[PDB]
Amino acid sequence: NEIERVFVWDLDETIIIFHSLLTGTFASRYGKDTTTSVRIGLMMEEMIFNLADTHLFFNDLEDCDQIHVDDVSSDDNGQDLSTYNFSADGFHVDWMRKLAFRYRRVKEMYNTYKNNVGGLIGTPKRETWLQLRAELEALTDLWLTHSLKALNLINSRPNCVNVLVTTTQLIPALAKVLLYGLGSVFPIENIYSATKTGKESCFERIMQRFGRKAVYVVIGDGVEEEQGAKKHNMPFWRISCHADLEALRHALELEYL
């Protein structure tokens, strides 16, 4: 694209793969009730799969772990499949054509229901989650709410864009981004799933797309991408603490990024 700055996000360990929730380590680190945190994480993981299994063809695409939604865009005989019954087909060159049908359908539901999730999963299944969010953000001090301020401050920039790089399979990552509210700030074409190939392959897959005329900045938590972002001359912005986000937003408000 014509974007000048690219912000790569690694929201695992905090948002996408919040494995600190189920392990109970989050409650130990931050002095919260362990049992309450585990219950909220297990319910979230259910609401996600109940959304993915009933709308994004999870059970079909569990092993067919692609890396980008447009990865198999070559084999799609582009046709109006509004009547195509996915439950009654030879699914279990002719298979890749059937496989691409689902990814285009996944994209259609994504781009349609990212600001209307009650239309995808009917209400009150959205009201149940909005209740689930506040119950968790009361433990994380509105971490997802805080991170969206930095995401919208970048999405609102015409020269800047933000992309997502997680290690989950693409479909669950799309389900989490859809529910959690990150759909407005992460375009579906800017979400990469480093499941089988590692984050380095995804980082290299990005720079070939946005070119050498762009300024790449990596925002994440951990060290797995620390060397992965250093070996590609991408400045790493740690994001562990809460003040790290206020400073990040501060550094964004003053055009330092």
Ligand X SMILES: O=C(N/N=C/c1ccc(Sc2ccccn2)o1)c1cccc(F)c1
Catalogue the active-site residues.
Answer: 10, 12
Compute the least distance from the CB of residue 147 to ligand X, in Å: 8
Q: Identify residues 105-164 at the interface with ligand X (CB under 6 A).
A: 133, 136-137, 140-141, 143-144
Please state, in angstroms and rounded to a whole number, the distance separating the CA atoms of residues 39 and 20. Answer: 13
Please state, in angstroms and rounded to a whole number, the distance separating the CA atoms of residues 113 and 135. Answer: 24
Tokens of 36: 């309450």
Stretch that binds ligand X, among 11-19, 50-58, 77-85, 88-96 (CB under 6 A): 11-19
| C-beta of 143 vs 186, nearer to ligand X | 143
Please state, in angstroms and rounded to a whole number, the distance separating the CA atoms of residues 81 and 173. Answer: 25
CA 254 from centroid of its chain's CA atoms: 27
Cβ–Cβ < 8 Å for 174, 57: no
Binding marks (x or -) toward ligand X, 162..181, rule CB under 6 A?
Answer: ------------------x-
| C-beta of 132 vs 207, nearer to ligand X | 132
Binding status of residue 95 toward ligand X by CB under 6 A? no
Residue in 231, 212, 160, 175 with CA at minimum distance from that of residue 8: 160
Compute the least distance from the CB of residue 248 to ligand X, in Å: 13
Q: How many CA atoms lie within 13 A of 219 on its CB side?
A: 25
Compute the least distance from the CB of residue 148 to ligand X, in Å: 10
| C-beta of 31 vs 90, nearer to ligand X | 31
| Distances, alpha carbon 44 to alpha carbons 17, 131, 153, 157, 179, in Å | 11, 11, 27, 31, 10
Stretch that binds ligand X, among 13-21, 51-59, 64-72, 200-208 (CB under 6 A): 13-21
Binding site for ligand X (CB under 6 A): 14-15, 18, 30, 133, 136-137, 140-141, 143-144, 180, 242
Residues tagged in the binding site annotation for Mg(2+):
10, 12, 221
